[PDB]
Design a protein around this ligand. Structure first.
Ligand SMILES: *C(=O)[C@H](CO/N=C(\C[C@@H](C(=O)O)N1C(=O)c2cc(O)c(O)cc2C1=O)C(=O)O)NC(=O)/C(=N\OC(C)(C)C(=O)O)c1csc(N)n1
Length: 502
């Protein structure tokens, strides 16, 4: 009977062929699959022991973050009604129905037994009847469309009726809050950028729903969370953090066989200026870009061979994105994300000890793909996204070492946040499986970034500031904001900027 364990030693699950301390089904499945590829059906029989890269504390932080974040978003959009309406049915029968219902993401099924002007009485699977306050029901305004909502409910009867099958969430003070299972989905992945080990993975709201692992299976458009790769290529192909690029509309042609306006490359990056991103790619040329980009972990077959590439219209997985961002985090090295740390035998003999490519402090040396100075300047700029840009909500963590980037696809069809420090790389996706707008007022920063912040808050709790150390070969010089070139003394507006020795 296959036993899957976390790095810290907690039992995730067991697999066999004809009690979990840590709930990590997405991780569990990844191990089961990997083991089967390695040993066959004999993996389930022999009693092997798999030791994963995940840490229990971090795993539950991820789990909670995604759940809370999906619930927060869901409520903002209203109530979509009960799961079942069982009026006139006996308590014994209600208990019968409830018996075949399961908890989905800490959200327990309950049947409304009574509706009072003060609240509701609900029965759980156990048969226990408990009160639910009108306060926890006040949010339950009618959902009409991802953009339209009904009026605020004025009494519990407006929201629920006896026989209604609802959801209740227990709190730290034993009380039950009136909830609903979100229709939106999310994906969280956190890595150690040193070797590419997955420290936490969440492939949806509940495995307890579908077994689909959106962290590794779902290919979504990264939008602006992709720009760094274009800008990194820029820094490595003639441009500088100072390079002035006109943010203005782009006229275009086909011929046989926007404010700001001209701004520094750094300004454009934290400000997600698409016109700049197009012009940079233009100068770089599609091919050169793709060849540079793929080296980060992306597949040539996912990268659009046109202008749209600059806008992040590629189809990628949160694991691919996280794997790639790790390049900037670890100072320029390609790491291969992994989940099996150890495979032990029946008796305890070590059958497998993962030796991944590792960044410098026998182990496999990690290949360097980009200039250490590139990784440093790139980090510098991406920290501004938190400091000045779209990541201002992440300043709440009171940390200096944070670098990141929000991403919002057209019509808010996807919401992203990808970021790090030298400790962890965390990639957060939010959206609908069948794409639809998350809402007019919804962005990567309003859906994903909150989840990300919650998780990074916990992960980096007792962690001191850890950013990349300045590598040899960087120079900070005064620049004329108007010319983008070295500023003579007495230049108004002159500012300092880092550069690779020209
Ligand atoms: C990058 O993803 C690029 C720019 O938009 N990116 C983000 C949204 C963000 C911002 O641009 O700063 N943002 C707003 O525009 C905005 C307006 C507003 O009134 C309030 O209150 C807040 C915000 C806000 O946070 C980001 O997360 O970084 N996006 C795109 O290029 C694509 N679509 O753009 C829109 C704006 C979402 C759109 O509907 O057109 C895109 C890239 S691939 C694809 N299919 N679309």
């Amino acid at each position: 009977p296959l036993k899957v364990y976390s790095e810290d030693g907690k039992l995730i699950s067991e697999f066999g062929e004809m009690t979990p301390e840590l709930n990590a089904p997405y991780i569990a499945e990844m191990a089961r699959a990997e083991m089967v590829g390695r040993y066959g059906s004999e993996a389930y029989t022999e009693g092997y022991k798999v030791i994963t890269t995940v840490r229990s504390d971090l795993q539950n932080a991820a789990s909670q973050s995604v759940r809370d974040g999906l619930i927060d978003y869901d409520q903002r959009h209203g109530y979509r009604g009960p799961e079942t309406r069982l009026p006139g049915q006996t308590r014994d029968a209600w208990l019968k129905h409830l018996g075949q219902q399961r908890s989905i993401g800490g959200l327990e099924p309950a049947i409304v037994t009574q509706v009072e002007k003060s609240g509701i009485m609900v029965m759980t699977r156990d048969g226990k009847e408990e009160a639910v306050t009108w306060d926890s029901m006040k949010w339950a305004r009618p959902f009409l469309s991802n953009n339209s909502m009904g009026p605020m409910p004025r009494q519990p009867a407006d929201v629920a009726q006896a026989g209604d099958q609802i959801r209740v969430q227990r709190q730290e003070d034993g009380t039950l809050r009136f909830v609903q299972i979100p229709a939106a989905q999310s994906a969280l992945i956190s890595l150690d950028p040193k070797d590419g080990a997955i420290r936490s993975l969440v492939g949806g709201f509940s495995f307890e729903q579908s077994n689909y692992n959106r962290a590794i299976q779902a290919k979504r458009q990264p939008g602006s969370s992709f720009k760094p790769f274009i800008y990194s290529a820029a820094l490595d192909n003639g441009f500088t953090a100072a390079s002035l690029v006109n943010d203005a509309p782009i006229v275009f042609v086909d011929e046989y066989l926007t404010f700001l306006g001209p701004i520094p490359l750094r300004e454009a990056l934290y400000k997600s200026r698409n016109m700049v991103s197009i012009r940079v790619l233009q100068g770089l040329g599609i091919e050169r870009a793709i060849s540079y980009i793929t080296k980060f972990g992306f597949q040539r077959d996912e990268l659009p061979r046109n202008f749209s590439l600059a806008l992040g219209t590629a189809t990628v997985t949160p694991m691919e994105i996280a794997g790639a961002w790790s390049v900037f985090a670890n100072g320029g090295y390609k790491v291969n994300p992994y989940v099996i740390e150890r495979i032990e035998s029946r008796d305890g003999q070590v059958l497998y000890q993962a030796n991944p490519p590792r960044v410098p402090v026998e182990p496999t040396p990690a290949e360097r793909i980009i200039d250490a100075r590139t990784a440093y300047i790139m980090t510098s700029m991406l920290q501004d996204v938190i400091k000045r840009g779209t990541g201002r909500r992440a300043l709440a963590l009171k940390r200096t070492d944070l670098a990141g980037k929000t991403g919002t696809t057209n019509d808010s069809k996807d919401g992203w946040f990808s970021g790090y420090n030298s400790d962890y790389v965390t990639s957060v996706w939010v959206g609908f499986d069948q794409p639809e707008t998350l809402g007019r007022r919804e962005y990567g920063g309003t859906v994903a970034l909150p989840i990300w912040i919650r998780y990074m808050g916990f992960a980096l709790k007792d962690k001191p500031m850890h950013t990349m150390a300045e590598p040899p070969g960087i120079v900070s010089l005064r620049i004329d904001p108007v010319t983008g070139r070295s500023a003579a003394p007495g230049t108004p507006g002159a500012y300092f900027e880092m550069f690779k020795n020209e």
